[PDB]
Symmetry: D2
Subunit: 251 residues, 4 copies
């Protein structure tokens, strides 16, 4: 019977057509949030919107690329047109080329920075200004355990994640006075069916060994934290990093 004060407000969830973003959208809607579900995938974004409408919640699907600053502008105006924008979850992420730092391809590095960092930046610009004018809010940026620690062959990913904590802090420092809070969430390895369906049974069991809890997290487990940080309950929580990693980074 978990419910969060996220009503009477619109909420953007970028990359919300699948996995953790989906879990976020559904959870936020199911506490009364007007959820603008944005994604490169028009059809997934609609497929989610349909569940939220079917569950009894308001939700709308903008399709687009977060690397387009204009698309960030157009997700804020679409959200504001459901309810005042008072929530943004910059979740949309790709995993990138699997290569060492000396072998990493300059286009693949640049792509991973563009999406996992710069698109969060482009998205935040019209989120901060909207929330700031309409009296306050909460931006949740989707980082990782790998915004704190390393993992071999995922340098660009590791690097992007790490960058987010600094942009999170700075946005939080700058817009605290406008009562717009900015936090970062830091999951351990989550069973997003991309992961499940990409990994061998041997590989899955290895990562499982990295986390003290002895499993991978579920999307719903990240969403619950995101929803809490996005709520009025977390009114004193800004600029900070929050792990959901079943004890990965504790050793």
């Amino acid at each position: 019977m978990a419910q969060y004060d996220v009503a009477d407000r619109s909420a953007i969830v970028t990359g919300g057509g699948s996995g953790i973003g989906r879990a976020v959208a559904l959870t936020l809607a199911a506490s009364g949030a007007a959820v603008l579900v944005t994604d490169l995938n028009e059809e997934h974004a609609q497929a989610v919107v349909a569940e939220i409408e079917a569950a009894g919640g308001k939700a709308a699907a903008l399709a687009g690329d977060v690397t387009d600053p204009a698309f960030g502008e157009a997700s804020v105006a679409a959200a504001n047109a459901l309810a005042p924008l008072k929530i943004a979850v910059n979740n949309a992420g790709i995993g990138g080329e699997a290569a060492r730092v000396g072998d990493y391809s300059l286009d693949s590095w640049r792509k991973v920075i563009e999406v996992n960092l710069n698109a969060v930046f482009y998205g935040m610009q019209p989120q901060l200004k909207a929330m700031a004018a309409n009296g306050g809010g909460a931006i949740v940026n989707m980082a990782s355990i790998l915004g704190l620690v390393g993992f071999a062959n995922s340098s660009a990913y590791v690097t992007a994640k790490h960058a987010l904590l600094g942009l999170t802090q700075n946005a939080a420092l700058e817009y605290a006075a406008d009562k717009v809070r900015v936090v970062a969430v830091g999951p351990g390895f989550i069973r997003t069916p991309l992961v499940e369906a990409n990994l061998s049974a041997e590989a899955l069991a290895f990562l499982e060994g990295k986390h003290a809890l002895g499993r991978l997290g579920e999307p719903e487990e990240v969403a619950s934290l995101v929803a809490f940080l996005a709520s009025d309950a977390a009114s004193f929580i800004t600029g900070s990093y929050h792990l959901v990693d079943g004890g990965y980074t504790a050793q």
Copy 2:
């Protein structure tokens, strides 16, 4: 309309007679938890159980000293009477003398360690075993911003809150496989009646400037995070540190 997944179990709130402890007990009871308010101050702890009971909640008081390991054994029994124990908040803490390391009294150092660190460990011992026995749960150790950063003339206090992150980290690693989660919460300067009663207007301002949000935090604001990480919704969050600091440590 915030509500947390803590029903059908007992919660020990140490130093729950007053301040953030009192906010926590209130907030935990209100969502269905059976709260054992433990305090030195038997009557404070009673006063709090009444508000719970006059709000429809369930709760009992136990007066004792967390510095006595026995009292921590006795707190777990008393809680497990009410319902199976699955939450414990080690919240009880004290200020200690206002001095520089080189001028610190060997008693005030030893005292602040004993209460603010050792007593947290003493309570944890039975807390863990009892939670493991009954298939798992959640321990939230009340730390601070000052378990991460310094404050001048509060060495003993800062040292103790730093310590708590390690204890938290080890306990989480060691009892993951028992589904017993352990986390720590770092508030910024909270507006308790003792802080309101102690601070000059000038000193109060100075601390406000140090927080990005441009105010001290309210107890209910710490209470909310604690209730969430104590809840089933936080089932993948363990060993981690969680700030509720209004952007104090983001600069």
Copy 3:
């Protein structure tokens, strides 16, 4: 009267003609390091080389832009031509537009990222492979206290410097087997010529008041740490972040 085990090997130092990168190159070459001083400003790189050679040290200038991957291929080759490349200090950086996250120029954001992060990555690529090749070495990345904590209106910079900590961690993990150590250094505010030149005395004062020591650092004071980490003495130090901030991030 300090000396460093940095002899019989070549040492790239990006941003070499000015402030901190200059001090690095001096300190390294004064312990017998063959210093390639690389920089946009040919004639600034030349003026440092001369100071080295004048003190007895072996140094070469190679003016260009680190935002060209070609110019890190070339910088390495021209280092290997003096002595085996066993040291690289990715020090070159820029500050970017003084503006809020919401108002931040996209041009300036991408230009601050490019120099401070991507160029570090482009120049680390051949560095890593080159040092791996001459049976080991050490890369030092010039981050900041602002890879740890925020400073408002410098979001891009802060974001960039935060990123380096991940890249650094990932490089280290990935090339530890090949005995190539990677480490970040985090200075606080340093009185470079350009910092002394553009700060007003009022600004300068305010900053000194945020550092415990009550002054800004000197470049001499950053180069020593850089030199030590880049030496054979720091043989068991890889992947870690080392603050030279006069107590700035301790509060």
Copy 4:
């Protein structure tokens, strides 16, 4: 040919008789420091002074228990007699029992805390006062990787070392005005001869795998960083925690 600007003054190295304390004494002395080995083992402390005078340096033993505040007072008198005290390494530490938090021996916990933390504090009080009067100095506090991250079954230790970073921060803030620097070192697992002696082949192989460099640290490698941070070359470094771990904490 590494040398450190640690001359024209006395150093305290507590635990200076064996392992990382012994390596520290040897390294400091060689660069013109007048070392006061202080240790429990009367003999071992003397055998280290002998190695120091044999290589040509200046050194004195003083056998005692750091847990005795008076012995700190006496150690500092002894140092101030050799030369004005401007180094203090609080190196002296013990393991405690290998048990879970819930089963952990209450005296073994209290013992560990007493030495690893409180003794460092007891010792610091006269260290700090003496260094402020005689125009500044440095205090290196020996922490560990286990001051940041957990290790299963060593909870009292992990706790004690975490605590050191708080004490280290606070001291640093309070006496920065008096030019007393306070830092912490975090070694990874170090194959000191006592550790060479107590590990099975199976257990040593397990720890080596946890370190990116794929071997345990040598005590000379920890000795070098301690020496640097203690030196005039580190004059803008205070309040900070310096890992020498072999990439242990970078994953």
